[PDB]
Design a protein around this ligand. Structure first.
Ligand SMILES: Cc1cc2nc3c(=O)[nH]c(=O)nc-3n(C[C@H](O)[C@H](O)[C@H](O)COP(=O)(O)OP(=O)(O)OC[C@@H]3O[C@H](n4cnc5c(N)ncnc54)[C@H](O)[C@@H]3O)c2cc1C
Ligand SMILES: [Cl-]
Length: 227
């Protein structure tokens, strides 16, 4: 969260949050080069631009991936500000940072998952507790051909033809929100699709399987095959 250094980067101070998250004690920090927490993650130009900005008097802003002691990595979002003389010359440096511990890990994850899901070439969507699409894979969007953003708000029934059997569609929907396994053929419509046009219908074999998460949480995992 907060530290101050002399012009050369030697930590003069060293706040409680900084000690907390760095898992370093204030006495192991004070008098150390701020390089102590460096991680190897950043290239020298990132560091060189930082020092090139602050030493000419300007505020700097950026993220830092830092090293905790036990060698583990954290993230911080920083603003570094110079303190001046007299002769308008930087004399000390104040760094105010929030720990983005955390939101960063919770993000490199999604990217991995998202990356794996996206490569699935089965047509798949995910539904929340209310049976609204929380995710639609590229195979499905491609074949639909609706862009995922058309889709996210909705209802899988947005994929169905106006010709579809309403009583089946409803069975599916009720399975989704209950959440129970369901499957079995619905007439879908795809955009062809400038259009409007539009529009071919085709029988879809459809499976849903509920997935309970923690916190009374529910997702419906949905497969769409051409029957
Ligand atoms: C207030 C304050 C807070 C900082 N917080 C962090 C932090 O949270 N995490 C972190 O990794 N680093 C931080 N630094 C800076 C620092 O230098 C650490 O060493 C950094 O980790 C450097 O890594 P490097 O070994 O890759 O440097 P090197 O890159 O090997 O430095 C060599 C090149 O010339 C440059 N240059 C011009 N003046 C200087 C100077 N005075 N010191 C170093 N290079 C200079 C560029 O640094 C450039 O990289 C902070 C500095 C200040 C002043
Ligand atoms: Cl058939």
């Amino acid at each position: 969260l907060v530290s101050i250094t002399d012009l050369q980067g030697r930590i003069l101070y060293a706040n409680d949050n900084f000690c907390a998250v760095s898992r370093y004690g204030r006495e192991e920090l004070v008098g150390q080069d701020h390089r102590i927490v460096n991680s190897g993650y950043h290239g020298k130009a990132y560091i060189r631009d930082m020092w090139r900005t602050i030493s000419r008097g300007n505020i700097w802003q950026g993220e830092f991936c830092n090293r905790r002691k036990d060698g583990t990595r954290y993230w911080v979002d920083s603003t570094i500000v110079p303190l001046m003389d007299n002769a308008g010359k930087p004399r000390q440096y104040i760094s105010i940072r929030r720990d983005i511990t955390a939101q960063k890990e919770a993000e490199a994850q999604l990217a991995r998952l998202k990356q794996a899901m996206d490569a699935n070439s089965e047509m798949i969507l995910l539904t929340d507790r209310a049976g609204r699409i929380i995710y639609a894979n590229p195979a499905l969007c491609r074949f639909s051909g609706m862009a995922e953003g058309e889709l996210l708000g909705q209802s899988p029934s947005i994929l169905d033809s106006p010709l579809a059997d309403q009583e089946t569609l409803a069975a599916m929907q009720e399975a989704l929100q209950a959440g129970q396994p369901w499957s079995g053929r619905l007439l879908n419509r795809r955009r062809t699709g400038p259009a409007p046009h539009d529009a071919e219908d085709y029988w879809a074999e459809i499976s849903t399987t509920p997935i309970h998460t923690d916190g009374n949480g529910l997702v419906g995992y949905v497969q769409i095959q051409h029957d």
